[PDB]
Amino acid sequence: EIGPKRGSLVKVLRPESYWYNQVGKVVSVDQSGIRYPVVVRFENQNYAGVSTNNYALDEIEEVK
Amino acid sequence: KQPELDPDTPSPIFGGSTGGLLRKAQVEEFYVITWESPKEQIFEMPTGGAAIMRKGPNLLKFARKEQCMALTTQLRSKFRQTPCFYRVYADGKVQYLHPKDGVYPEKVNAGRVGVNQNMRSIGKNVDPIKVVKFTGSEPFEI
Amino acid sequence: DIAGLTPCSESKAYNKLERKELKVLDKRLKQYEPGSAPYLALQATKERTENRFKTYAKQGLLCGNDGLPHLISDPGLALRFNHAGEVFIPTFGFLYVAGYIGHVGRQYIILSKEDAKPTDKEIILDVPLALKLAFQGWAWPLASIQELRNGSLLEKDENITVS
Amino acid sequence: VKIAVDRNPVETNFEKWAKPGHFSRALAKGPNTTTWIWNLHADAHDFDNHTSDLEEISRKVFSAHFGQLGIILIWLSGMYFHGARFSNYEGWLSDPTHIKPSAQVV
Amino acid sequence: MKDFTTYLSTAPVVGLGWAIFTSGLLIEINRFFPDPLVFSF
Amino acid sequence: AHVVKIYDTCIGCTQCVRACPLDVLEMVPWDGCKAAQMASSPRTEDCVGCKRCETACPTDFLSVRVYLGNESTRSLGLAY
Ligand SMILES: CC1=C(/C=C/C(C)=C/C=C/C(C)=C/C=C/C=C(C)/C=C/C=C(C)/C=C/C2=C(C)CCCC2(C)C)C(C)(C)CCC1
Ligand SMILES: CC1=C(/C=C/C(C)=C\C=CC(/C)=C/C=C/C=C(C)\C=C\C=C(C)\C=C\C2=C(C)CCCC2(C)C)C(C)(C)CCC1
Ligand code: SF4
Ligand code: SF4
Known about the structure:
6 chains; A: mainly beta; D: mainly alpha; 0% strand; binds beta-carotene; binds iron/sulfur cluster; Photosystem I reaction center subunit IX (chain E); transmembrane (chain E); photosystem i (chain E); plastid (chain E)
C-alpha cells in the first residue's frame, strides 16, 4: 500500500549504487515503516557478490 | 560487574617461543586476557605452539590486542567460553575494554549512545569546496 | 614514378636479390641426388620462389631503392594508376568479414538475453543457433543500415554510469 | 595388509561434465562472473578443496597418477614413432661421427 | 549421447572446432594459392 | 587516528563486528525490521585500518568507510 506492487520490476537511482538505471524486481516493500522500505532483488552479482539491496522510495522510479 | 585485573594468576604449561614480549611490552603497554577454561584441555597459542590448560579461570597475556581477540573468537568457535581484556599504561593504570557491555559488542546491551556517525545516505557528501580547513579527516558533523 | 619509386621489374636490386636467393638455394640443393625426397622438396621450393618473383610483377607494384615491394595505401594513388589491390579492396574485405562476425555475435548475444540464466548459454553455447546465425549474416550491410534507421541498436540511456 | 576396494562407487556418465565446477558447490551454482572460469581451472585438481573426504581424495590422486602415466607413455610412444617413420636414424647409425640427429620434418 | 552433445558446447568445442576450421581453411588457401601479397587487380 | 564513519544505509546484520579483528565498533539502539541494530565507532585508539569491516558489510553502498589518517604504534601493528 506504500511502495510499488510486489513482483513489479523497477529501476534504481541511488547515485552511488552498483545497480543504477537498470531494472530489478522488488522483494517486499517494507510496510512496517522505515527510510529504506523497498528491497530490490537483482540476478547479476556485484563486486561483492550480493544480489539484493534496500533503497528509499524517493529514489526508485517506473519501468522502461 | 566488569572484573579488573588480578596479578599472581597461574599460567598454562608451555615451553616458550619467539613471539612478542619485546621492549614495547615493558615501557609502553601490555594486554591481558582471562577466561574460564573448564575440563583441562589442549589449545593452540597465537604466537607459539600447543599447550595444556587446567580447569578453572586462567589468565594469559600477549603484546598486540589482536593476539587476544583471536583467542576470544576461537573460544566462541568450539566451546562456549567467555574471556575478557585489560589494558596497561606506563603509570600502571589499568583499563578494561572487552567486553565493556559484557555481551560481546556484536550484540546490543540494554542501552547506550554511540558516536562517530551521521544520518546521511551513502555518498552525497560535501565537495572539496568549503572544506579548506580539512581538519585531518572531517567528521562532517561536529 | 610516384614517391620516387620505380616499377619493380626495372629494379636491379630486385633481380640481384632473386639471383642471390637462387644461388643460396642451389648451393645446398647440389647436396642430394635427383631421386631422393629432399631434392624434390628443394625443387618445389625453388619452383614457387621463381613463381613469387614472376607473379608479383604484374599490374604494377612499386619497389624502391632497396628493390623490395612497397605497398601504397592511399586511395587516389591506388586510383589514377593500377594499385587498387595493394590495400584498398583488402580493406573492404576485412570490413565485410568483421561486420559479418560482429553482426552474428551481437544477434546471438541479444537473442540469448531473453531466456532464464543466459550466463549458461555463454559457457554452453547454442550450437544450432550459432550455426543458423552464421549462415545468415552475409547480408549484414543491408540489415545494419536499416536496423540503424530502425533504432533497435541505440539504448535509450538506461545503463550504469558514475560521472 | 590386504586389498580393499568398492564396486561401482561412481557411475560412469557424461552428466557431471555438463556442470563444470560440480566438485565445488560454490562454483556449481553458475558462472555469474568471469572469475568463475578461472576458479574452475585453478581448483579442478584441488582435491582437498572439493570435500574433506580423504578417502575420495586418495582415490582421486591414485587415479590422476594413471592419468599422468598414460600421457607419459603416449609421449614416449610418440618419440619412438617419430624416430621410426621420419628420421635419419639408419643414416645416423651407419655414420654417427658427422651425421646429426633429426626426427622432425616440417 | 544427450549429455555428450551438451558437453560439446564448451572450450573443447567451437574454440576447437572453430579455429580448427579457420587454421585449416587458411593453410589450404595458402597451400593451393602459394604466395599472395596483393589482389588480382 | 583512522576516522571511521557509519551512514544511515544499514540493516544491522551484526557481521562487521563478528569480523572486526580488533573489537573497535559497537551496535546499540536502532529501530529496524527484524534485528534493529546500527553500528557505531566509540573508540579508535586501537583501530589499525585493516579494512576487514568493509569487506563483510553487505550494504550498497558500504555503511562504513575507513578514512585513512595518521599512524601510531597501534595503527602500525608494532609488537616492538
Ligand atoms: C587474411 C586476410 C584478410 C583478412 C582476414 C581476417 C578477417 C582476419 C581476422 C581476424 C579477427 C576476427 C581477429 C580478432 C581478434 C581478437 C584478438 C586478437 C584478441 C585479443 C586479446 C587481448 C590481448 C585483449 C586483452 C584485454 C582484455 C581481455 C580486455 C581488457 C583490455 C585488455 C587489453 C587487457 C583479407 C581476406 C581481408 C585480405 C587478405 C588477408
Ligand atoms: C578509405 C580508406 C582509408 C581512409 C579512411 C578515412 C579517410 C577515414 C575515416 C574514418 C571514419 C569516419 C571512421 C568512423 C566511424 C564512425 C562511427 C560513427 C562508427 C561506428 C560503428 C558502428 C555504427 C557499429 C558497427 C557494428 C558493430 C561494431 C557491432 C556489430 C556490427 C555492426 C556493423 C552493427 C584508409 C586509407 C585509412 C584505409 C583504406 C580505406
Ligand atoms: S579497519 Fe579493521 S580494525 Fe578498524 S574497525 Fe574496520 S575491521 Fe576493525
Ligand atoms: S556490517 Fe555494515 S550493514 Fe552490517 S551492521 Fe555493520 S555497518 Fe550495518
